[PDB]
Design an enzyme around this catalytic site. Structure first.
Site, short mmCIF file in Angstrom:
data_model
loop_
_atom_site.label_atom_id
_atom_site.label_comp_id
_atom_site.label_asym_id
_atom_site.label_seq_id
_atom_site.Cartn_x
_atom_site.Cartn_y
_atom_site.Cartn_z
N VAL A 43 0.92 -1.21 0.09
CA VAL A 43 0.12 -0.18 -0.08
C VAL A 43 0.97 1.31 -0.11
O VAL A 43 0.68 2.02 -0.71
CB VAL A 43 -0.99 -0.22 1.21
CG1 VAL A 43 -1.75 1.17 1.54
CG2 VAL A 43 -1.96 -1.31 1.08
N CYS A 44 1.61 1.25 0.92
CA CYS A 44 2.64 2.28 1.05
C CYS A 44 3.41 2.74 -0.32
O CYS A 44 3.72 3.75 -0.70
CB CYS A 44 3.72 2.16 2.08
SG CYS A 44 3.17 2.52 3.71
#
Ligand code: NA
EC number: 1.11.1.25
Length: 213
Positions: A43-44
């Protein structure tokens, strides 16, 4: 604890752009400090990629981006190479802080201890806050999404626009406001003062008066 309206603490750190002093990096620009628990996490990675692609949107608003992740700079450099590939960007124009021992995260109240590296033990799940900082180094807005849920770049830009507008014109913005929408006259402003400054307004209630942007 840090909250909105608190001063964003200054710090020195090693980053992907070399050693920096945070205040010096920011200068007189607005700032967005965004946090990540670790490098090479999905996600990051998508999030940093998006900020990288959209950096021009931030540049035009006099906003400097800066990322924090709890790993060393060497790790961040490799991560940026992946991000460039994924995002299809020629470069990532902002720094990523190498907070190997969680010192900066600690300073920003995201963890309760400093001095140790990323152990994948779950103690870093809270290193996920985003702080919007003004030119005077005041924290203006904070948000914390878990690493499981990707952020919204459009919303970050929307709030920046609202904050800048409010500072510039002395107005306030309603729920779901978009630029060019009508704004609200702050209650500290009397109707007579409002007539002097804004002209015409629609008084829904004495405390709720809309005026054109
Ligand atoms: Na009026």
């Amino acid at each position: 604890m840090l909250r909105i309206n608190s001063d964003a603490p200054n710090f020195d750190a090693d980053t992907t752009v070399g050693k920096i002093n945070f205040y010096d990096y920011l200068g007189d620009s607005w700032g967005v400090l965004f946090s990540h628990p670790a490098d090479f996490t999905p996600v990051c990675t998508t999030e940093v990629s998006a900020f990288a692609k959209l950096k021009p949107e931030f540049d035009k608003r006099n906003v400097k981006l800066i990322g924090l992740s709890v790993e060393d700079v060497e790790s961040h450099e490799k991560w940026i190479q992946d991000i460039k590939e994924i995002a299809k960007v020629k470069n990532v124009g902002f720094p990523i802080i190498g907070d190997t021992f969680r010192n900066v995260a600690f300073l920003y109240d995201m963890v309760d201890a400093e001095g140790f590296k990323n152990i994948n033990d779950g103690s870093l799940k809270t290193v996920r806050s985003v702080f919007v900082i003004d030119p005077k180094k005041k924290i203006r807005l904070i948000f914390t999404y878990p690493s499981t849920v990707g952020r919204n770049t459009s919303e970050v830009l929307r709030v920046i626009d609202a904050l800048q507008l409010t500072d510039k014109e002395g107005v306030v913005t309603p729920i779901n406001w978009q630029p060019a929408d009508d704004v609200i006259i702050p209650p500290s402003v009397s109707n007579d003062e409002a007539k002097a400054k804004f002209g015409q307004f629609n008084e829904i209630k004495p405390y709720l008066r809309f005026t054109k942007s």
